[PDB]
Amino acid sequence: TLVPDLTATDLARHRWLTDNSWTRPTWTVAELEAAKAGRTISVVLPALNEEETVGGVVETIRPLLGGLVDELIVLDSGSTDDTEIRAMAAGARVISREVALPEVAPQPGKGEVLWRSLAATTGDIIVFIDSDLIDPDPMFVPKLVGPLLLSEGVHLVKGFYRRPGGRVTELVARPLLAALRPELTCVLQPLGGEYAGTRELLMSVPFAPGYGVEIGLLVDTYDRLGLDAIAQVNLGVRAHRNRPLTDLAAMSRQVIATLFSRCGVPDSGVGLTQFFPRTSEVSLVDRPPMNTLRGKLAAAL
Amino acid sequence: TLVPDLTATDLARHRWLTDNSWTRPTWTVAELEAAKAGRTISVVLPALNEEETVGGVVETIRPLLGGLVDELIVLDSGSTDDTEIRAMAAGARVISREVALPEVAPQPGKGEVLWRSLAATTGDIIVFIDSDLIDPDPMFVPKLVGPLLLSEGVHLVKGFYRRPGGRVTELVARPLLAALRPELTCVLQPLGGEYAGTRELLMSVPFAPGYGVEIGLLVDTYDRLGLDAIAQVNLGVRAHRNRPLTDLAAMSRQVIATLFSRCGVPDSGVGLTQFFPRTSEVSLVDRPPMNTLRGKLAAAL
Numbered sequence: 001t002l003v004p005d006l007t008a009t010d011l012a013r014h015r016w017l018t019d020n021s022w023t024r025p026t027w028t029v030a031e032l033e034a035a036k037a038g039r040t041i042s043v044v045l046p047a048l049n050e051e052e053t054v055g056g057v058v059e060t061i062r063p064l065l066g067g068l069v070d071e072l073i074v075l076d077s078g079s080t081d082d083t084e085i086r087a088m089a090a091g092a093r094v095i096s097r098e099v100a101l102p103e104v105a106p107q108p109g110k111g112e113v114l115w116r117s118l119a120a121t122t123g124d125i126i127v128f129i130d131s132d133l134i135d136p137d138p139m140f141v142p143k144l145v146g147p148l149l150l151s152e153g154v155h156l157v158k159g160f161y162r163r164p165g166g167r168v169t170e171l172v173a174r175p176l177l178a179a180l181r182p183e184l185t186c187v188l189q190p191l192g193g194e195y196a197g198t199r200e201l202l203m204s205v206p207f208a209p210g211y212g213v214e215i216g217l218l219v220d221t222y223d224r225l226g227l228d229a230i231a232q233v234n235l236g237v238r239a240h241r242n243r244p245l246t247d248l249a250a251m252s253r254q255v256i257a258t259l260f261s262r263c264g265v266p267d268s269g270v271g272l273t274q275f276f277p278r279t280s281e282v283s284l285v286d287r288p289p290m291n292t293l294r295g296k297l298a299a300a301l
Numbered sequence: 302t303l304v305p306d307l308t309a310t311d312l313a314r315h316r317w318l319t320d321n322s323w324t325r326p327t328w329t330v331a332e333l334e335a336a337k338a339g340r341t342i343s344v345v346l347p348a349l350n351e352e353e354t355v356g357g358v359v360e361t362i363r364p365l366l367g368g369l370v371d372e373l374i375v376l377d378s379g380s381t382d383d384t385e386i387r388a389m390a391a392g393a394r395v396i397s398r399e400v401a402l403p404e405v406a407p408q409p410g411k412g413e414v415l416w417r418s419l420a421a422t423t424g425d426i427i428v429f430i431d432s433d434l435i436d437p438d439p440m441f442v443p444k445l446v447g448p449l450l451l452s453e454g455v456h457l458v459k460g461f462y463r464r465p466g467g468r469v470t471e472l473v474a475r476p477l478l479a480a481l482r483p484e485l486t487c488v489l490q491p492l493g494g495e496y497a498g499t500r501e502l503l504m505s506v507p508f509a510p511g512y513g514v515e516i517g518l519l520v521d522t523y524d525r526l527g528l529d530a531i532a533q534v535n536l537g538v539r540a541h542r543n544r545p546l547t548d549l550a551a552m553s554r555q556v557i558a559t560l561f562s563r564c565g566v567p568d569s570g571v572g573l574t575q576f577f578p579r580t581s582e583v584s585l586v587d588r589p590p591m592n593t594l595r596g597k598l599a600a601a602l
């Protein structure tokens with residue numbers, strides 16, 4: 001709703017940009033591992049047909065397994081290429097959507113994969129890393145768990161990249177956040193695929209379907225716990241991708257639907273038509289908080 | 302709101318794409334002029350510092366003046382370059398914002414300019430043409446008035462271009478229209494600057510400020526008169542511009558604010574911050590329908 005007390009100039013000077021945003025993180029792995037204090041860490045890579053890149057992402061994380069990282073899992077989203085074998089050969093455990101949660105038939109989309117990974121993991125902290133990254137850096141996981149392990153009251157950490165500009169992020173997500181959740185425009189890259197959260201938080205929020213999942217988690221965390229529970233950390237440089245605009249438009253439509261559902265805005269539910277005459281669909285139905293399925297699964301949560 | 306009766310596939314097949322959309326218009330100037338039947342046509346070019354292009358746009362329209370076109374006006378938006386003299390030298394009448402409506406102090410933005418041009422024009426039909434066009438074609442005005450003069454019940458005509466993809470249009474405007482006014486996704490280029498409307502319609506709707514003006518007029522026309530009152534016509538090929546993403550993000554923010562204000566969505570009113578640390582503002586206040594100022598102006602409407 002209307003927030004005439006907040007201005008853009010205020011947001012550009014927001015204290016959160018100082019206390020909860022790390023542009024030059026300097027935590028070491030050894031000190032992060034010393035700070036775990038009994039918490040365990042699960043790293044989850046969603047993967048749909050990523051045979052060319054998945055092993056490279058896994059190998060940047062695998063030296064952490066058994067130390068900082070307790071579980072390293074690729075959640076296979078129905079791949080028909082060599083994603084599974086290559087992830088295994090790079091040192092990851094691979095779990096299909098069906099094995100993660102056999103009682104429920106899989107739905108398409110990235111949100112489904114991350115939701116199911118809650119049932120397949122045990123860590124008190126869960127780190128998500130995209131498996132299509134061409135140039136992953138081995139400090140991703142340590143930087144993402146830094147605020148969870150050391151800072152107090154942080155439950156969600158968003159990893160951002162410096163440019164050497166994501167169009168949906170800059171034109172869709174951040175301007176709609178300015179309109180609907182203006183404090184969240186402090187987050188540099190709200191749609192980022194590299195982020196970490198505590199299990200308590202992630203088990204208690206719905207998961208948006210498809211490409212809505214990241215923005216849904218960000219807004220639900222903000223609504224439930226406030227901006228101070230969210231942090232962001234610089235992962236380094238990333239050469240920004242060059243995805244087709246038509247893919248981006250269908251993705252923007254789902255981002256809009258998920259943000260509208262979190263913000264009380266009545267979305268029509270109608271998919272996006274594009275003309276050259278092509279259509280895509282949108283989902284208005286989340287997966288409920290995984291906590292709701294507690295007690296009813298063959299594998300305990 | 303929720304429209305579970307409409308699907309994207311429906312929209313891709315919509316009868317409106319047949320009866321109200323002209324991909325290959327073949328009207329001649331002589332037959333359009335014969336169909337005026339006492340109506341007059343005003344052509345209005347908003348111009349803020351367009352010295353390099355304004356004369357070229359004017360010259361493509363000027364041979365129509367005294368025949369199909371009754372008035373040809375450049376509405377100078379406070380230019381400090383040679384826009385005014387060059388428009389005059391190309392054959393247009395140039396009117397400042399102050400002279401268009403002296404009783405009211407000018408506000409910044411394109412919407413203000415077009416709103417004020419209602420008070421400066423007399424045509425029963427008003428055609429808007431951007432003055433920054435590098436390659437205007439002399440058939441623009443005839444194609445835009447075709448449906449107004451020949452078809453029945455059309456009050457707004459949107460000119461679109463074939464590509465040899467506008468990012469705000471494809472990622473922001475059309476997906477938000479899919480969510481909030483799904484029938485309007487039939488319109489290929491809702492943010493287009495080349496369009497025509499009847500005076501009765503344009504005098505009776507508010508004008509959104511700044512870059513919200515085109516989408517505000519489209520949604521208000523749709524809400525007031527329905528989709529059949531809107532038409533679109535192919536103006537030909539246009540080499541799409543290459544504006545900076547940062548300009549596009551500020552523009553997207555205002556498009557969002559204007560669409561939200563028309564659709565009952567509570568916009569926060571907060572401007573957009575962008576980080577590299579830059580801010581832009583957004584307006585939630587329209588100019589009221591010009592009909593409301595009737596009787597109170599020194600120049601009668």
Ligand SMILES: O=c1ccn([C@@H]2O[C@H](COP(=O)(O)OP(=O)(O)O)[C@@H](O)[C@H]2O)c(=O)[nH]1
Binds near residue numbers: 046047048109113130
């Ligand atoms: O149904 C899906 C869609 C995406 N992804 C994964 O989620 C990440 C982000 O998807 P994106 O579409 O950006 O990747 P792409 O294959 O297009 O490069 C990638 O690791 C995908 O493999 C997935 O596991 N399941």
Ligand SMILES: O=c1ccn([C@@H]2O[C@H](COP(=O)(O)OP(=O)(O)O)[C@@H](O)[C@H]2O)c(=O)[nH]1
Binds near residue numbers: 432
């Ligand atoms: O306050 C304004 C802003 C824009 N325009 C005009 O509206 C059109 C669209 O503006 P845009 O910003 O796309 O043009 P630019 O100068 O950026 O090429 C152009 O003819 C501008 O000269 C205007 O008259 N007043």
Ligand SMILES: [Cl-]
Binds near residue numbers: 051055086
């Ligand atoms: Cl491999």
Ligand SMILES: [Cl-]
Binds near residue numbers: 078107
């Ligand atoms: Cl599926």
Ligand SMILES: [Cl-]
Binds near residue numbers: 167168169170191
């Ligand atoms: Cl993006």
Ligand SMILES: [Cl-]
Binds near residue numbers: 200201204
């Ligand atoms: Cl919680």
Ligand SMILES: [Cl-]
Binds near residue numbers: 352356387
């Ligand atoms: Cl000139």
Ligand SMILES: [Cl-]
Binds near residue numbers: 408409
């Ligand atoms: Cl001004």
Ligand SMILES: [Cl-]
Binds near residue numbers: 471
């Ligand atoms: Cl555009």
Ligand SMILES: [Cl-]
Binds near residue numbers: 501502505
């Ligand atoms: Cl009317």
